[PDB]
Symmetry: D2
Subunit: 258 residues, 4 copies
């Protein structure tokens, strides 16, 4: 199996990476960061996110593993003390898959893939968009912005906005509001909305057409936008799992007590 | 086809029912409230809920239709002026199905079926339960109570508690909190939780073992409770649909503007 | 000075009480639980609440002190290890005062005093009341109920309902909602409301006239209610303070870290 | 009396302004936009905000009046059809005063006055600040940002963030959170905080020292910030009131029904 390892870049992670590389040398494993089948991230969830986006053109060929050298992460859910055991079993595991979010931006097309979420805010002044669900005008949103989250992304920005946590086996996306204006004149639903596969949520500008669009860590300013279109991606991220670490236990460990 | 019609019992609904019965007489339709295949509710969503629970032993044999003589309802989504057209097509439609919630209460077993939600509060004093997810202890909840909602139930009590609205094609259940106590000593997740099929959420008492349990409109006091167990039911409610009235449009009509 | 001491009634608190009584005997202090000028509560905030309500007819004559034998309390904010130092200075301190909430219930009048909050829920079925502010009809509330909190009460039930914490030097009361129904037909403000002195908030029934009314720990069923009237009381609770323990530090210690 | 009139600049407002100027000419009133004692705003609340900030150096010399040519505003609470009656009584009224918020920014000092609120967000990346209350370290906030609101400002951005509405007779300020991160590692209070006069809330950077600071409509990027300090201002805005239009009625008219 070809493999590669990204590191957070501090002393802890680089030395752990060099030790795992040395451990992999004692087996029949070839280090290749061009066409790896196994991508190991050492650091935190942000390190894992960058690893995912480095190889998002070969998602169907890769199994990801995360090692957290800091606190417990939702994607980096292996302890550094287990790195040797990881090297052992990695050289011959079952795969689990999580859904992803497709974002399409049109001008007068660019598509992005998100593992956590995709957000939209205004660049110049007030944020006003018409929210269209499966070609049906649903609401005119006025506020700070909107956030569309994957299932595994619900524990991240989605959670801080009041969204629900949903198990990653559910093929869905969740839309949450950012500081909406609600009075007798302006009306939004308020509640988070959970959409299934094949449902298309479209954002269409009213006045201003420039928007700051974020996809996970990446945040780009887009000008002369005609439409922002969300849907559950056809592609999935594949993890290499070696033990039972249930999602709800990861949620407990991160937010209740560990 | 055998059929029956329940009415809210006011003048508006009873007269509409008698007119539909007369209209059905002009076809080959036999009124039977014992083994109907078509159950028509005339009134509101509460009238529809009672109709559902009257015949929950024959859910697989029945297609439900709701007529709202008051405001627009989420289950009663036909206007009274369309009753004649309803009678026409009902005598020879496709069926749509929504998931349901199974509640199991154990003592020292009773099972219930919910179309909207099932809630738990304390009878004598403070409400404290341990929340167990797939045999994993998740949290110790202290507050007013908890609510487990079906997908179509998310627009009802679940919404008032801050839960997400989710499309009824998703086979899931959603747990929301009622006024939880959170300090350095007591910790709950806070966020709504969305569970897929085959996940089991179990509530287990800590001190008091008497609970007020509600299932849709029905609210019963239970004594010496050992466990409350939630899961997505294997059974579904079947609707008779004659036109496209999308769920998200029903949501818009009920909460944004109609 | 006359004094008295209430105890939570467990072994820890009773033995601490007997030791303080013995310590007070070594000074010129007379134990009197009929007309005390100093009321010492040993236990938790609930023990302090009962002490407050035991002597609410002589609030202007008494200075209260709380000792927490369990976790840090907002009213019982002395450690048991400081009981000897407390006895010393108590025998000759400055006084601080917190505002209180007056509740008036009318039938076809009973007045109550609250240190934390006063809540209203329905007894038989759905809760619907008209909210009147200084004789101006403000809203028709439909939901689980309402909560009116004192400033020091904002850290208690008010906090679990999403209310703001406000410093107890502000003579005000705060009204929060319990699971309100909001659609195109039914509309509430949603936000917590903070009222100054001399503002009167009145709740008036629409259909059902029986309500479960709570005042701190005390919860009574009232029948044939015509009006529930809230206002900031003219009376205040007086504390004996011996050191600087700021409210915001108590908030930090209870909810952030201690 | 000297007076001046600002206009939203559309056809409706300019023509109303010219008519009021003509009406004022029929009395002994001198138009002076340098040292006016009466400042009339015609348009919306944003027009009123600009009028307030045009003359914030002479707040003690001026009485403000707002006319809303669009929907009902919280500061512009006179209808255009009443402009003639306004001119009449304005030429010889009692004054009401609302508290204001003082913001002080320090580098390696600039002070601002807010009628609605003052917000802080990050410019480059993640927002992390230490919140200090009266020199006591209260929390380390991580999220999108923070908002400190005046009493009359509570109906504006503060409301969209979940803050409480408080009557403008209360001399206070309210701090609300923007999408805070809360887990076992990072902890914020969550609830809105209401501070009285003479309480000082200080924000102190942890890593990044560049912040986007907004004061009402005005939003400025500040670099190398050492401290952001909030307190209730000693100065107040004075309104000219001619009739009883209670704050809670304005709240009802804007959010419940008008
Ligand atoms: C700590 C930063 N972080 C990232 Br990056 N992704 C996530 C996630 N999915 N859940 C929680 N936290 C996350
Ligand atoms: C109006 C009462 N009501 C009932 Br009953 N069920 C529902 C529901 N599913 N969504 C919204 N509202 C409901
Ligand atoms: C722990 C129970 N409790 C009582 Br009783 N009063 C309060 C209060 N004011 N703030 C927080 N918690 C309280
Ligand atoms: C409509 C814009 N707006 C402005 Br500007 N100030 C306020 C305010 N205080 N309350 C509500 N809304 C406001």
């Amino acid at each position: 199996m070809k493999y590669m390892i990204t590191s957070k870049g501090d002393e802890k992670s680089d030395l752990l990476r060099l030790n795992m590389i040395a451990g992999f040398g004692e087996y029949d494993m070839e280090y290749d960061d061009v066409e790896p089948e196994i991508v190991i991230s050492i650091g935190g969830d942000g390190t894992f996110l960058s690893a995912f986006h480095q190889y998002e053109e070969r998602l169907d060929e890769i199994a990801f593993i995360g090692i957290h050298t800091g606190h417990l992460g939702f994607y980096a859910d292996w302890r550094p003390a287990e790195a040797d055991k990881l090297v052992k079993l990695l050289a011959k595991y079952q795969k689990v898959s999580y859904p992803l979010l497709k974002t399409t931006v049109k001008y007068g097309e660019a598509t992005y893939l998100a593992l956590n979420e995709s957000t939209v805010k205004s660049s110049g002044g007030p944020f006003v968009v018409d929210v269209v669900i499966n070609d049906i005008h649903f609401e005119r949103f006025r506020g700070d912005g909107l956030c569309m989250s994957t299932p595994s992304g619900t524990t991240a920005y989605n959670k801080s906005l009041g969204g629900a946590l949903m198990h990653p086996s559910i093929e869905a996306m969740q839309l949450t509001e950012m500081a909406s204006i609600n009075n007798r004149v302006y009306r939004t639903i308020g509640s988070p909305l959970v959409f299934p596969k094949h449902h298309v949520v479209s954002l269409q500008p009213v006045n201003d057409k420039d928007f700051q669009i974020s996809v996970d860590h990446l945040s780009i300013l887009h000008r002369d936008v005609q439409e922002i279109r969300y849907e559950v991606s056809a592609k999935k991220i594949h993890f290499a799992r070696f033990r039972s670490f249930p999602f709800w236990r990861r949620v407990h460990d991160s937010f209740i007590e560990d």
